[PDB]
Amino acid sequence: MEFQAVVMAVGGPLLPVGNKPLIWYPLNLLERVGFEEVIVVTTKALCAEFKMKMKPDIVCIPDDADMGTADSLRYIYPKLKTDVLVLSCDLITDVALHEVVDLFRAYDASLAMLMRKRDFIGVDSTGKRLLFMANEADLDEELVIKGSILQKHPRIRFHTGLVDAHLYCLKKYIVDFLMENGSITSIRSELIPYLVRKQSASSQSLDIYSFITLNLAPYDACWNACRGDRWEDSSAQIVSKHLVGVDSLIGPETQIGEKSSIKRSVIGSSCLIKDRVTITNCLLMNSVTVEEGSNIQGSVICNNAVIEKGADIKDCLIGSGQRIEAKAKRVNEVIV
Amino acid sequence: PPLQAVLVADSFDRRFFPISKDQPRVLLPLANVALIDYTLEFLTATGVQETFVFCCWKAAQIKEHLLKSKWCRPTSLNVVRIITSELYRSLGDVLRDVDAKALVRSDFLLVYGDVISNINITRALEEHRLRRKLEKNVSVMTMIFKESSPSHPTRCHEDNVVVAVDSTTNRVLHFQKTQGLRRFAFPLSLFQGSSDGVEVRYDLLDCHISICSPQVAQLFTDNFDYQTRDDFVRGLLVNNQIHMHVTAKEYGARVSNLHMYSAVCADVIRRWVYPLTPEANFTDSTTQSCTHSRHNIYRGPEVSLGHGSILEENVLLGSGTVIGSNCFITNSVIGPGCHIGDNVVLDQTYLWQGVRVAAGAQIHQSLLCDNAEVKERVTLKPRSVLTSQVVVGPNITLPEGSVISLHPPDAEEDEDDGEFS
Amino acid sequence: LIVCAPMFKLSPQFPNEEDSFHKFVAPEEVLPFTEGDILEKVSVHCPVFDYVPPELITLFISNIGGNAPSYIYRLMSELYHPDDHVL
Amino acid sequence: QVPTRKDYGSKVSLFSHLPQYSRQNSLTQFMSIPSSVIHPAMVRLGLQYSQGLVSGSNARCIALLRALQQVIQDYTTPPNEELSRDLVNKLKPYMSFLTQCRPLSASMHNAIKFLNKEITSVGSSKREEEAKSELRAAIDRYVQEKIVLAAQAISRFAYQKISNGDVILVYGCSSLVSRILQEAWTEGRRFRVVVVDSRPWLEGRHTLRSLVHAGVPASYLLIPAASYVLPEVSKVLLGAHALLANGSVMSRVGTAQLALVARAHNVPVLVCCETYKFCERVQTDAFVSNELDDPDDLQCKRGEHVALANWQNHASLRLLNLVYDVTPPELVDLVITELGMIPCSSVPVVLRVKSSD
Amino acid sequence: QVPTRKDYGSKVSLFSHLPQYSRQNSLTQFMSIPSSVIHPAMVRLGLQYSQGLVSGSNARCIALLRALQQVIQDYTTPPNEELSRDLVNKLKPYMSFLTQCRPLSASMHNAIKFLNKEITSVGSSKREEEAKSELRAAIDRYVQEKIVLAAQAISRFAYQKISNGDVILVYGCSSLVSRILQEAWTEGRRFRVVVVDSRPWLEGRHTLRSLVHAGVPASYLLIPAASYVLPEVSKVLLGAHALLANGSVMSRVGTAQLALVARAHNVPVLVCCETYKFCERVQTDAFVSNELDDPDDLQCKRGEHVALANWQNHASLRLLNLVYDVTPPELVDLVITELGMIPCSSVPVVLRVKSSD
């Protein structure tokens, strides 16, 4: 058991959750032996939001709000006995967690990404090694191609929106030879120091590889776009014998009245309707309720939402926690 | 739809000197036959009945040389359109003539008289024609231009081409040349339009081949600010997009400088262009019919080999030739009538008509011309050129560069011959 | 070795008249243009046609029937008048 | 514990014996990636073997031995246990793991019987640290003296061998005929070298790159046309993956007819195999035990006309490609190794001498 | 016209283009036993072939010749079907019948072609009976001139060839090799002839008995130990049935390997086939057009504990035996025929100068 895994915190963590953060297709695919050398460093209250996710062992250490990813590794660098598998908590993807770290051993990358089809990524012929990635924070002029990249690799597929998954596999070689060179923070923007060609990291070529997946969408920090709409594997709940949901995320101990059926919807724990909860296409979170006339159609009913007795709201981020009784909310998002 | 072509002689962004004085830039005998016959049997190799060759330079010469071919008479599938020397400058007034005289319906081949190749062109011709029929004539042309490496003798830095292009629907983006640039930069505004991706390709050498349907007569005579084809297609690529096809096997390249003369004269006998290989006797020249033999030598008729003259790679002789003893000749061509005497060492000599070499003479990496009584110990080195009746003597040696002739200002020589410096 | 050999594609020729007994084609069949910097010097060659000894094949499947691989002179006594085989 | 790798595609009519693999899946597709009972250096080895990037003659050897260096020199011991007899039984799952990842060549069997005998030699009298250090010592000596010293020794002896004016053909897939021909040239001979090869790996690539970067004259051709290289060639060289107890030349498949059509001019062979590679295994001819790669490495390319695109649409229109080949010891004339030039059938006593005797 | 003979036991996996028989059940278990569906001489020659009664060299030719002469010289000439062309097509059940019985020697094919060509040579314009007698005169002068005048012509020529003390061998069953032996012996000569034979015919008997009754010293060894005549043979007479147009010859199981073991010494093989035996069918391998006799005739007499009685009880065992064979034209050098002593590869040029030109 050598190479270890760590969890990050933020970007732009646990916001769009009805009842469960469905990071479970990570934690159902490869946790039989699995996933033992894992470290929680995320958003003391952080030691109480993962006693429900059935992990075998854990290391829950806090880092400060100024989340330099490089500072997040500088804090627990000595307890990195071996290599790093940074998988942030800002992740939902179902993709196969073995081949994404089997391309880690192809020509043994010092650093291995995983991306998914403005923010450019270049790549070689065979979809194996990315050469330079770039976002707009280093390009006000267009882009530069050097001599040697083109004089050696003549066929270069470019990309411009092939968005990240945040699966970074990582070898201790470059974190030694770049960590103490403190002028490179932001490990997402450390990839622009690939630092390979004739231009320190290579402290003496370097190996980097990514895998372009083709199955799910990217991670979500504050969406639940297809994450409330994520087919988890109803599962174990109870109903008023008529909750016809579209395999719907029914949080159990629900207070169903007359045909409360939040179809295509995350009806969370105590997702109460004393009347017809119809197909919401929404997410009615924990301790949220549209009772006695559920007008449930697209209204994002977030953490302890309150809109009921004609919950007139659609196509918006509806009221997250704020008490709005006769909420005639609109296409614009309801108040915080 | 019948298939014709125009065949320009010479773009005067000039690189040939002083060989373009008595004979032209286009009657350049690569293996003892005129280069017009090589490019013309490229145009007869693929199927084109009628083509237009334009002449500007001493109509008496090309007139007389086109009086003794066998497609002088249209018994074969060609007769040749030739015209005489009024106001002609370069390809500019050629295309202004071809839409003023208006000898064009659709889809003709634009080649210089300076490309030798073996592309049977018709494949991408019909793919281009499908692209015309299907999509409303937004695609102007299609250029076919080779796949190669970043390292080749034909991709010397004068016509080095990088293009950026998609690979699904193969329409180009940047025709950015590289005569001296080494940092590369592509304007990023045209990558958000194709977010699935876009390749870049450097595996290219331009065959100077491409087809043209007379939309470009409109986009050429309207826009006077384009004259050569390169700034033309860049102006096409800034405003009508133009397409691309990457051929896989067969090739040709334009014999621009003498660097390409060396590479092509060492490739027709390394034989990368068969059917073209000069045993075929394209002319009715019984003074050219030569006999192939093992390891690519080509003895002429009444060859008169010198005793012990060993031959290894890619040589010739001519008719009426007398070669002397002790010749270690490799990768060369020799011309007819040559009284090349005894103990004359050669290596990649490109010797032409009427020469009589004197005995005991290394010659190396040279190309020389008619009626040259060359004499003792004229040792040379790469990129050396003698030309047209000037006579050197007992070891007037020459270094790397040699712009010499018999004419006074271009040469390194006055009125008389090069006997004394 | 049974040779398949119709009676028209017989030749009264010999290996000796000149060369181009074989046929040399463009050798981009055996090399690509995707190598790097190598192909400047290695002088490639290929025929498409080889030459086989008469004395090793076994019999004809021919349009008279079978023949021994060195019987052929009787057929070439008949079919071609050899004073104008040289023509 | 270790799962299987299944068949890919219709197996050939003869080989029920040796199973078929393909590289568009892995054996690591099944197994848990925190490598709990199998060790990451072995799986690095098998997963890089799966792509055929290290496929050379001695390269599989040196990759295995340096791998098992980093295997045995980071091991932690068990308590209440016999120390040297905890090990070679524990090696069996890893070596069967390599077996199931890709089946072994002769060099790898030399290696496994080597450390088998030496773990069996180095007993349990001492603490594990200098035992591990002497393992490092023995294995470093092993690759050092055998590979490197064999290399320079046969360089000298074949330099003594090779004669001027002699246009020699090769068939190049080793790390050794390139070496032999480089420092045959570096002392200033005059030879002119033609290489010949064939699909699927097309190993005229590696030795053209070495030789053309070493600056030698040439001319290229390939194996069906190798009877145009009858009449004016006066030597021939061939590096083999193994020579066995008969004098059997065992290598890639393009090894066989070159010698015999050369023997149709009496210009005889020279095999360059140093004495690491030899083995006690004997097989008489070409089918009893070879390996076989991913069978879809065979497709020609004529534009779009891929002639063998899907070979499963008819129920049996089907291919396989074998990797090893053995001509009988009648026609091979010379071997070149550390102990001189051994003419052919007298090889197994050269095998015998280095066997703890 | 005729049914076919059933199979007996099992067969090898290879020879399923070849039928096998038994002589425990034959053709005329069932068919029209007063023979008028087919001419009587045909079922006569057929069921005496089924017990091998005429199994000779040109004895088989003359047996079918007497059968077909008893066909033709009592033949009713029907109207409404033509003078000469109801014979040959009604003769198609004759040789298809004998092909069903036990297949043809190529001598009988040459007989078929000659009487074919001659019954075409007499068409319609002559009355059927004296045309039938001219057919008798043609077939009698044919078999007389070719068979008999060829036998005495090669007797005079091989009497000029063979000299004193020439110890010559036969694989003996014919009426030409023992013929040349006796009528070379009785003219003041001396040569110790040895016969060789083979299981299961065990036939040398006609030749050795006719030699000893002609008074010639004989020896005897069977081809399963034919490597003991290996040094001492001075020349060898090979009795071949047919002689193809490769230059090959054509005879039994036991001229297969003596031909090669006596090419392996430069002892010049000498085959005896007259002008009658020059055929036109040309085979190359040894399983193509080769018969297969009754496959349960190879048993052993070891008291009573025979291994091959109830061989159908257990699953997969088989039997087989070939009968004819072809030797390549490398080995065979000299044929014994009329116009001279023509060599091997120049045979069919004689076959065109007696083929109506």
UniProtKB/Swiss-Prot annotation, chain A:
Which domain of life, per UniProt?
Eukaryota
Cleavable signal peptide: none
Q: Which GO terms describe its cellular component?
A: cytoplasm; cytosol; eukaryotic translation initiation factor 2B complex; guanyl-nucleotide exchange factor complex
Any Gene Ontology biological process: oligodendrocyte development
- SUPFAM superfamilies, alphabetized: Nucleotide-diphospho-sugar transferases
Family statement drawn from the similarity comment of this UniProt entry: Belongs to the eIF-2B gamma/epsilon subunits family.
What is the recorded name of this protein? Translation initiation factor eIF2B subunit gamma
Q: Which organism is it from?
A: Homo sapiens (Human)
Curated annotation (Swiss-Prot), chain B:
The UniProt entry lists the main location of this chain as cytoplasm
Q: Which UniProt keywords apply?
A: Acetylation, Cytoplasm, Disease variant, Initiation factor, Isopeptide bond, Leukodystrophy, Methylation, Phosphoprotein, Protein biosynthesis, Ubl conjugation
Composition bias, Acidic residues: 411-421
An individual GO BP term: translational initiation
Subcellular localization, as worded in the UniProt entry: Cytoplasm, Cytosol
Note the subunit structure.
Component of the translation initiation factor 2B (eIF2B) complex which is a heterodecamer of two sets of five different subunits: alpha, beta, gamma, delta and epsilon. Subunits alpha, beta and delta comprise a regulatory subcomplex and subunits epsilon and gamma comprise a catalytic subcomplex. Within the complex, the hexameric regulatory complex resides at the center, with the two heterodimeric catalytic subcomplexes bound on opposite sides.
Family per record: Belongs to the eIF-2B gamma/epsilon subunits family.
Protein name in UniProt: Translation initiation factor eIF2B subunit epsilon
Organism encoding this protein: Homo sapiens (Human)
From Swiss-Prot, chain C:
Q: Where in the cell is it found?
A: Cytoplasm, Cytosol
The entry's protein name is: Translation initiation factor eIF2B subunit beta
Source organism per UniProt = Homo sapiens
Function comment: Acts as a component of the translation initiation factor 2B (eIF2B) complex, which catalyzes the exchange of GDP for GTP on eukaryotic initiation factor 2 (eIF2) gamma subunit. Its guanine nucleotide exchange factor activity is repressed when bound to eIF2 complex phosphorylated on the alpha subunit, thereby limiting the amount of methionyl-initiator methionine tRNA available to the ribosome and consequently global translation is repressed.
Give the linked disease: Leukoencephalopathy with vanishing white matter 2: An autosomal recessive brain disease characterized by neurological features including progressive cerebellar ataxia, spasticity, and cognitive deficits. Brain imaging shows abnormal white matter that vanishes over time and is replaced by cerebrospinal fluid. Disease severity ranges from fatal infantile forms to adult forms without neurological deterioration. The disease is progressive with, in most individuals, additional episodes of rapid deterioration following febrile infections or minor head trauma.
Similarity remark: Belongs to the eIF-2B alpha/beta/delta subunits family.
Curated annotation (Swiss-Prot), chains D, E:
Question: How's its activity regulated?
Answer: Activated by the chemical integrated stress response (ISR) inhibitor ISRIB which stimulates guanine nucleotide exchange factor activity for both phosphorylated and unphosphorylated eIF2.
Q: Name one GO biological process term.
A: T cell receptor signaling pathway
Q: Where is this region: May bind the chemical integrated stress response (ISR) inhibitor ISRIB?
A: 5-14
GO CC terms, sorted = cytoplasm; cytosol; eukaryotic translation initiation factor 2B complex
Q: Does the keyword section mention Protein biosynthesis? A: yes
The principal localisation class reads cytoplasm
Q: Which GO terms of the molecular function aspect are on file?
A: guanyl-nucleotide exchange factor activity; translation initiation factor activity; translation initiation factor binding
- UniProt effect for mutating residue 324 to H: In VWM4; with ovarian failure
Family in the record = Belongs to the eIF-2B alpha/beta/delta subunits family.
Protein task: Acts as a component of the translation initiation factor 2B (eIF2B) complex, which catalyzes the exchange of GDP for GTP on eukaryotic initiation factor 2 (eIF2) gamma subunit. Its guanine nucleotide exchange factor activity is repressed when bound to eIF2 complex phosphorylated on the alpha subunit, thereby limiting the amount of methionyl-initiator methionine tRNA available to the ribosome and consequently global translation is repressed.
**Protein name per the record:** Translation initiation factor eIF2B subunit delta
Phylogenetic placement of the source organism: Eukaryota, Metazoa, Chordata, Craniata, Vertebrata
Gene name tied to this protein: EIF2B4
Q: Which residues of the full protein are shown?
A: 166 to 522 of 523
